[PDB]
Structure formats: structure tokens, C-alpha cells
Amino acid sequence: HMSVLQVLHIPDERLRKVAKPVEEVNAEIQRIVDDMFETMYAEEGIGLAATQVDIHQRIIVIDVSENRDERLVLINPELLEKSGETGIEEGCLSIPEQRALVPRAEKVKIRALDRDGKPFELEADGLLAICIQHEMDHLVGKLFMDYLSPLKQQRIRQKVEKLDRLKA
Numbered sequence: 001h002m003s004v005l006q007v008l009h010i011p012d013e014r015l016r017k018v019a020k021p022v023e024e025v026n027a028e029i030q031r032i033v034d035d036m037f038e039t040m041y042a043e044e045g046i047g048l049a050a051t052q053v054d055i056h057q058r059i060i061v062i063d064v065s066e067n068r069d070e071r072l073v074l075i076n077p078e079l080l081e082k083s084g085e086t087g088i089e090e091g092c093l094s095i096p097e098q099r100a101l102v103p104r105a106e107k108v109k110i111r112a113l114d115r116d117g118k119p120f121e122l123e124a125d126g127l128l129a130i131c132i133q134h135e136m137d138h139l140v141g142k143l144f145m146d147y148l149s150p151l152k153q154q155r156i157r158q159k160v161e162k163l164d165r166l167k168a
């Protein structure tokens with residue numbers, strides 16, 4: 001199925017919505033997962049949360065590999081443990097062309113359901129751990145800019161809106 005999902009941009013208030021847990025991993029949820037990967041890859045991202053495409057369910061897709069063949073699905077993820085501190089200049093498909101250093105845990109341990117509905121546990125570090133935290137934030141209506149000063153958040157909003165006016 002060819003995805004028709006649309007990635008929301010700030011300051012759309014639906015990006016602040018808190019997603020509900022998935023009740024059952026069935027064929028419909030699998031189609032959402034597969035469409036989210038297609039949209040992620042088309043937009044040249046490494047992660048996507050359902051909130052970013054106006055689906056208010058706890059679903060994340062991630063692929064941090066160069067060859068785009070390492071598909072991680074997190075349904076109803078739970079953070080079990082974290083340690084250390086790090087940060088990179090993160091970007092976000094919903095905050096186009098803006099980047100900023102964000103504090104993150106260096107290592108995380110999560111549990112989630114996979115695309116088949118099977119529970120699994122994953123220990124991650126590095127970029128993958130940062131991306132898991134970023135995407136889980138989306139599901140509770142949080143964006144990377146929320147960690148910056150209020151002035152910097154205002155400048156980010158203004159730049160995205162200008163970019164979005166220019167389009168069309």
C-alpha cells in the first residue's frame with residue numbers, strides 16, 4: 001500500500017496531543033506501521049512517531065541504518081532504565097531545517113511490542129538511544145525544541161512558519 005500520510009509541522013497543535021496505547025496489534029495497525037516507514041524513508045528521516053502523522057496511537061518506526069534495512073517498530077513502548085548523558089544537534093521532520101543540541105540519556109532499556117504484537121526488550125546506546133527518546137517524546141506531545149530557552153523556541157517557530165509560507 002502506497003502511503004498517503006502527511007507529516008505535521010509546528011505550530012500545529014496536534015503535535016502536542018498525547019497518544020493512546022494500541023489496543024490490539026492487528027492488520028490495520030500493521031498497515032499504519034508500513035505506511036509510516038514509507039513516509040519516513042520518503043522524507044529521509046530516521047524515525048517517525050504516529051503523532052507526527054495525525055495518528056494518536058503509541059506507534060513509532062525507526063531506522064538508523066545507512067542502507068535503510070534495519071526496521072525497528074515500537075508499539076506501546078515503555079522506558080525501563082536509562083543511564084548517562086549525551087546530546088547531538090537533533091533535527092525533526094516536524095521542525096524542518098532546524099537543529100539544536102538536546103540533553104538525552106546515553107543508554108536506554110525499553111520494552112515494546114513489535115509489528116507482530118510480540119513483546120521484546122531492547123538495550124540501545126548512541127544515536128539509536130537518542131532517536132528512541134526523541135520519538136517517545138513525540139507520543140507525549142513533546143518536541144526537541146521544548147528543551148531550549150523560550151526565546152530559542154520562538155525563533156524556531158518563526159523560521160519554520162517562514163519556510164512553510166514560502167512553500168506554495
Ligand SMILES: O=C(Cc1c[nH]c2ccc(Br)cc12)NO
Binds near residue numbers: 049131134
Ligand atoms: O522526524 C523525526 C526524525 C528525525 C529527523 N531528523 C532527525 C535528527 C535527529 C533525530 Br534524534 C531524529 C530525527 N523525528 O520525529
Ligand SMILES: [Zn+2]
Binds near residue numbers: 091093138
Ligand atoms: Zn521528531
